[model samples]
Target: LGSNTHLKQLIEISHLDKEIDSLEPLIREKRKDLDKALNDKEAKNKAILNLEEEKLALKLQVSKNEQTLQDTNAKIASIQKKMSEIKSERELRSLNIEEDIAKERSNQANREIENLQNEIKRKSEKQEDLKKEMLELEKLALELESLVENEVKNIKETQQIIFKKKEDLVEKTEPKIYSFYERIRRWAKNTSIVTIKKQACGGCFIRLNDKIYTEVLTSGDMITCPYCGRILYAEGA
Candidate 1:
């Protein structure tokens, strides 16, 4: 309800203020994206660590099997060497039984070693696949983080430029009106100002009662909507 000239000035000021105010949400959303990327990488790395532990355990099992196989071969060689020194039929028969038992042990160890080798091959292949996936995730996560950071930096620079223009416009506005406009932006979701239409508070869609509606129409001062507290302007007032 101010002078038409002052009304125009308030409109310009509100427009600029909102231009700067709108950056906050964009910045917050970009930050959330950055956090999500970082958290995903952290969780994946944790999984990768578990996979590595399993790989190491598998390698240990292979090592244990190889050691057993080596010892069995040595025992087999010793049995064959003693068989060459047999002196009688009975002694040779006893040595043959012992040699047969050693051969059986060696055969079982060979089978176990072969089974362990196959298992190690399978586990190693899976570990290699997991490593590739982790590397891919790492690259993607880093790219997303860098992308979001650069985007936020550009947005903040734009906000700074907008703030300079907004402050300049605020200089032409009355302190009370400007203060209310800034203070109420948060509650009104950065829409702290609106033009009245159809005898309603345009921001809230609530009908203005006579006392406030009359003030909006004729008070010659800035009026606030009673319910939403947004600075109100009536068309052609």
Candidate 2:
């Protein structure tokens, strides 16, 4: 004859169901931090890759510049050899002009090569620092990944426990009452049954008339609010 006791049990069941429903959001909240950590690690990796690509282009430029310097110097040397065998003043003057122009090109190529080498050195140092930062980010991501995995596992485990408790409580509930409650749960979700607080249907907040209120207070059988059709429990009773 413990109708009130059954209603109390049903309240507990409803609370447990709400907790179960919240499990997904809770897991998502836990994963948000992990996702941030992973994204940071990914950004660091991309930065490192970009630096390496830039350095590769710089190295290629340095090699091309060195080749230019070498070819210019070789052209000046051949002009010098031709000047040594010059047959006339006109040929000597032309070969001397050619040597001067080739020497100027060699100096320009040398300057460019030095500039590129210095840039490569600076970028190599930057790449080293970036690699070090990447290592730290990777370590942090691994730790966060494990933590989120464990937390998700724990949340799922708690869901199983909630399900077990709900099943046991459902089995103990009166078959008729539980089936009726299930019918309401299909539409109402968490608030399938609610309490009467301050003479209002907790499900719909509609004020109960005195007649229905009095019957809910005295009845040992299940009493549903007429307005909301949700089983109402008068806590003081």
Candidate 3:
């Protein structure tokens, strides 16, 4: 009301209070971002671990194939040596058949060994790529950590500063007027205080009549526009 200086003080305090309330979401967004970054880093690390396990399995298969190939070669060599020392033609012919079978088996083992070696090489390449990616992710995580840390520190400092100002302003406001201001501020969109400009309410842009304009300027009681219902004050009042 135009007659009440307490109303004007209440409106100003409510404006600053709304500003502080608006900062809540901004603070929450930073916290959410930091959490997402940490989650991504953890997922990347898990992928790296799975890749290492696959590489190890491939290495074991290659080792087994190499051992099989070595055994095949030794058997073929022993059979060939025995064939050279045979005296009877029948026995010699039998040794030749055995040698042919050994050679065939040895060829098959060699093919398997080659295949396993190729598989190992392919898996090793993939593991190397995973390692490189993990390192990059680690670096990115570190950078994000630093950024989040700094931002949180700044947000805390800003919050404290804002809180102190609000406390100071609240102490200066009258109790009954402050209660009304708090209620209206909760319902208002941007702010609770609106300056009368050019016979229009600054908050809602509704035109003011002559009676309301004069009362807003001279009455000193808290005044609200009939159309917008917002607490109105003179431009410099």
Among the numbered candidates, top lDDT falls to 2
lDDT of 3 by residue, 1-237 (tens): 334667757656666666667777877787685666567667767776787787788778778877877887888788878778867777787887887887888788778768867876776787677667767767766776777778878877887787798789888776767676667667775556788888889888988889989988887588877876678887655
Clashes of each: 0, 0, 11
Candidate 1: which stretches are off by over 4 Å?
1-4, 24-37, 49-130, 141-151
| TM-score, per-candidate, Cα-based | 0.55, 0.56, 0.50
What RMSD value applies to candidate 3? Answer: 8.5
Give the 10-residue window scoring lowest on summed lDDT in candidate 3: 1-10
Q: What's model 2's lDDT at 156?
A: 97
Give candidate 3 misplaced runs (Cα > 4 Å).
2-4, 18-138
The 0-to-1 C-alpha lDDT of every candidate, in the order given, reads: 0.76, 0.83, 0.74
lDDT of 3 at 74: 88
Compare candidates 2 and 3 on TM-score and give the better one: 2
Q: Across residues 1-237, which tens digit of lDDT does each residue of candidate 1 receive? A: 445566678678777667777778988888785576567767766766776777678778777877877887788788777778766667677877887887788788778767867776776676677667767767777777777888999998998888788778788678866666667875675567788888889989899998988987777777888887887888767
Best by TM-score: 2
The TM-score of candidate 1 is 0.55
Clashing pairs in 1: none
